[PDB]
Scaffold this active site. Structure first.
Site, PDB file in Angstrom:
ATOM      1  N   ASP B  92      31.154 -20.126 -36.819  1.00 61.07           N
ATOM      2  CA  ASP B  92      30.291 -19.550 -35.801  1.00 61.07           C
ATOM      3  C   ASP B  92      30.645 -18.074 -35.571  1.00 61.07           C
ATOM      4  O   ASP B  92      31.628 -17.532 -36.097  1.00 61.07           O
ATOM      5  CB  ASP B  92      30.280 -20.394 -34.530  1.00 61.07           C
ATOM      6  CG  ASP B  92      31.615 -20.505 -33.896  1.00 61.07           C
ATOM      7  OD1 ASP B  92      32.462 -19.634 -34.137  1.00 61.07           O
ATOM      8  OD2 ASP B  92      31.822 -21.477 -33.136  1.00 61.07           O
ATOM      9  N   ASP B 263      26.136 -29.875 -36.121  1.00 65.03           N
ATOM     10  CA  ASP B 263      27.538 -29.903 -35.739  1.00 65.03           C
ATOM     11  C   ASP B 263      27.609 -30.259 -34.271  1.00 65.03           C
ATOM     12  O   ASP B 263      26.703 -29.935 -33.505  1.00 65.03           O
ATOM     13  CB  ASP B 263      28.243 -28.550 -35.870  1.00 65.03           C
ATOM     14  CG  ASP B 263      27.867 -27.581 -34.749  1.00 65.03           C
ATOM     15  OD1 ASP B 263      26.821 -26.914 -34.840  1.00 65.03           O
ATOM     16  OD2 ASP B 263      28.608 -27.513 -33.756  1.00 65.03           O
ATOM     17  N   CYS B 301      31.186 -51.055 -40.031  1.00 60.09           N
ATOM     18  CA  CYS B 301      31.757 -49.790 -40.454  1.00 60.09           C
ATOM     19  C   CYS B 301      32.757 -49.981 -41.578  1.00 60.09           C
ATOM     20  O   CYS B 301      33.606 -50.874 -41.533  1.00 60.09           O
ATOM     21  CB  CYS B 301      32.464 -49.176 -39.249  1.00 60.09           C
ATOM     22  SG  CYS B 301      33.237 -47.589 -39.624  1.00 60.09           S
ATOM     23  N   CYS B 303      35.048 -47.715 -42.451  1.00 61.60           N
ATOM     24  CA  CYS B 303      36.156 -46.780 -42.363  1.00 61.60           C
ATOM     25  C   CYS B 303      37.509 -47.496 -42.377  1.00 61.60           C
ATOM     26  O   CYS B 303      37.619 -48.707 -42.136  1.00 61.60           O
ATOM     27  CB  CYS B 303      36.002 -45.865 -41.143  1.00 61.60           C
ATOM     28  SG  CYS B 303      36.762 -46.446 -39.599  1.00 61.60           S
ATOM     29  N   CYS B 306      38.513 -49.410 -39.164  1.00 60.77           N
ATOM     30  CA  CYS B 306      37.884 -50.713 -38.981  1.00 60.77           C
ATOM     31  C   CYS B 306      38.366 -51.736 -39.991  1.00 60.77           C
ATOM     32  O   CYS B 306      38.233 -52.933 -39.742  1.00 60.77           O
ATOM     33  CB  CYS B 306      36.367 -50.562 -38.970  1.00 60.77           C
ATOM     34  SG  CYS B 306      35.792 -49.621 -37.522  1.00 60.77           S
ATOM     35  N   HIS B 332      37.431 -42.941 -36.959  1.00 60.20           N
ATOM     36  CA  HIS B 332      36.290 -43.842 -36.928  1.00 60.20           C
ATOM     37  C   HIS B 332      35.009 -43.097 -36.541  1.00 60.20           C
ATOM     38  O   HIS B 332      33.956 -43.303 -37.151  1.00 60.20           O
ATOM     39  CB  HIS B 332      36.513 -45.014 -35.985  1.00 60.20           C
ATOM     40  CG  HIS B 332      35.234 -45.702 -35.664  1.00 60.20           C
ATOM     41  ND1 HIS B 332      34.622 -46.578 -36.534  1.00 60.20           N
ATOM     42  CD2 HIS B 332      34.382 -45.538 -34.628  1.00 60.20           C
ATOM     43  CE1 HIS B 332      33.461 -46.950 -36.022  1.00 60.20           C
ATOM     44  NE2 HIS B 332      33.297 -46.338 -34.865  1.00 60.20           N
TER      45      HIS B 332
HETATM   46 ZN   LIG Z   1      35.174 -47.574 -38.358  1.00 64.08          ZN
END
Ligand SMILES: [Zn+2]
Ligand SMILES: [Cl-]
Ligand SMILES: [Cl-]
Ligand SMILES: [Zn+2]
Lengths: 366, 366
Positions: B92, B263, B301, B303, B306, B332
């Protein structure tokens, strides 16, 4: 693997190197145990703890019995599952922090009552509910300094509590068959009390023996003086655990005096505060001298932090209060401690530990 | 790879999916950029950011120009080397946070003076010193609400500043040859001002066009109303970047209106505060209802969090103030955002984005 087997593979003077085999893994000794307060080694995933070389971690019981609670952790599947660490965990008894961190404590022969009852029996039960692999007997950590009378009274109560701990552990079949129990030598700095305590513990019989009461501000010279006579009193064929120690040079000297296991919060807590361990001594990364230093924290360290980031970056992170600063400093410091233990183990195995200790000190204190 | 090439591979209504190719990597669009404040995506190593699927991160300039300083970062090798992220970084301009975070600001046609001068020229230079891949033109983020007169005055100054930004960027050969420059449409909620701003930016010419001034508390209905007429005013063949947005449903609706890049700090900041995103809406993991919940944060999920840890454990960590709680929640949440973007990209590619948006909303708001 067996429930518990300690084997000594090599010796140099009083120093020993070997392994403890347990159901959840092998522990290389001499060993350093990172401290998990509240079911986490602060700022590290368990996989990162393991990547540093740790074989076992210490779980503080006092915090967990309050939050989330021991019965809750058991209902959720035990501490290993809860936090995602599948290797051995040694749990403390909770007795030391009950005195340090509680209010309105009330001590008796039965145990300690406190405000945020903990008896030998309840401590062993809590450690069972957590699913501890190495259970510590419940004892009283004698303040320093202590008069001979008060040190004797405290040690005698601790030995009565050691027998109660042994019997509580043995009366729970699943715990007795799958975990190990360590007893704790007390007696302050007094040789006769240390001997009485060792004799009482050996008569009861434990899987390992801790030297208690020496992380109490007495200074290294005095600690080493007490270890000189105290460690030989313990059974030679079982592990010797120096609770709450310590700085790198404390560890080296304690191994020279026959200690096999260590824990302390220094690498984690002081890492978050900006202190990084190096082979040339500790540095405080917050110091302005590091603001443009492109070298890693330590020039020889093999850890992921030293492969990827500079002192200048970590200086910036710690000064800015950034979480990643705590993460990187802690990973490096725990990795440093594990590399120290590896060098200790290798040097004993090769019959050159005395030279290693001399070289280590000359460079660390240059 | 080229300095900059945006290619649209598929379209559904106003929605587009494709790629931006830059020297440091390919960016899949629509894209979500995790925010790095102070040269770190808070609580994550860069390798963890990348494991979530992020192709590009946003670096805040305001903090870095103060600490460690832009010239210092340049002396140390640039932001990419400093923080260990080797893919594209969008920076930015610093102008928004100078107004939010400074004291004693003083605005003029030249730029803004503040206490912890920032002109268009100095902003572009700072972004060069950091080594930014996508440089933002320096502008004034118009407060909301704004009167038509004040919105017009602010937009007109921003367009003068856009030309100054273009000329400063072009006059630095290494920057012009290796980085890209985006212009920012202003004009508050007023269609005529948005059109004048789009026309001025297109006349100057930029590599991409941001829709500025819409993360300002106006509410989703109004934001979408302004996007409805504002995005079609921008060149179709260049990326469209909605600065500072936003919640998952804001992203879906903005993509339906032609936005390619996003963003915001919500996944990182609100993660550290206990809010976890799930396909069934956000949850606050601090709530007592999660204290014994063995399910992962989200049931689908993919990830690492998880796969390995329960709601009950993360609840405990966040309640205890543990750093690992912030780490796990942030990983996560950023992974969730990237999975949302992947589902958006795949659904546009397959001509089923309208159905995806409807299904997403029905479940997220059930
Ligand atoms: Zn997750
Ligand atoms: Cl700690
Ligand atoms: Cl953030
Ligand atoms: Zn290191």
């Amino acid at each position: 693997r067996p429930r518990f087997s300690f084997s000594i593979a090599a010796r140099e003077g009083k120093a020993r190197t070997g392994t403890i085999e347990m159901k959840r893994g092998v522990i290389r000794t001499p060993a350093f145990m990172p401290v998990g307060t509240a079911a986490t080694v602060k700022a590290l995933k368990p996989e990162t703890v393991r990547a540093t070389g740790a074989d076992i971690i210490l779980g503080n019981t006092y915090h967990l019995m309050l939050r989330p609670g021991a019965e809750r952790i058991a209902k959720l599947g035990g501490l290993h599952s809860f936090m995602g660490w599948d290797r051995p965990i040694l749990t403390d008894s909770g007795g030391y922090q009950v005195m340090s961190l509680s209010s309105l404590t009330k001590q008796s022969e039965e145990g300690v009552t406190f405000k945020s009852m903990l008896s030998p029996e309840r401590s062993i039960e809590i450690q069972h509910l957590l699913g501890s692999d190495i259970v510590m007997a419940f004892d009283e950590c004698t303040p320093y300094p202590a008069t001979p009378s008060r040190a004797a009274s405290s040690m005698e109560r601790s030995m009565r509590w050691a027998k109660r701990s042994r019997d509580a552990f043995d009366s729970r079949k699943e715990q007795a068959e799958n975990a190990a129990l360590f007893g704790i030598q007390q007696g302050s700095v007094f040789e006769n009390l240390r001997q009485q305590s060792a004799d009482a513990l050996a008569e009861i019989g434990f899987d390992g023996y801790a030297v208690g009461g020496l992380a109490v501000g007495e200074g290294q010279d005095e600690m080493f003086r007490v270890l000189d006579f105290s460690v030989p009193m313990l059974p030679d064929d079982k592990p010797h655990y120096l609770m709450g120690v310590g700085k790198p040079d404390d560890i080296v000297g304690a191994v020279e005096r026959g200690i096999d296991m260590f824990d302390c919060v220094l690498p984690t807590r002081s890492g978050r505060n900006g202190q990084a361990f190096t082979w040339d001594g500790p540095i405080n990364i917050r110091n302005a001298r590091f603001s443009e230093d492109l070298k890693p924290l330590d020039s020889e360290c093999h850890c992921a932090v030293c492969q990827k980031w500079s002192r200048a970056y970590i200086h910036h992170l710690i000064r800015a209060g950034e979480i990643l600063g705590a993460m990187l400093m802690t990973e490096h410091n725990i990795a440093f401690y594990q590399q120290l233990m590896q060098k200790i183990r290798d040097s004993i195995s090769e019959g050159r530990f005395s030279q290693f200790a001399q070289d280590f000190r000359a460079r660390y204190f240059a």
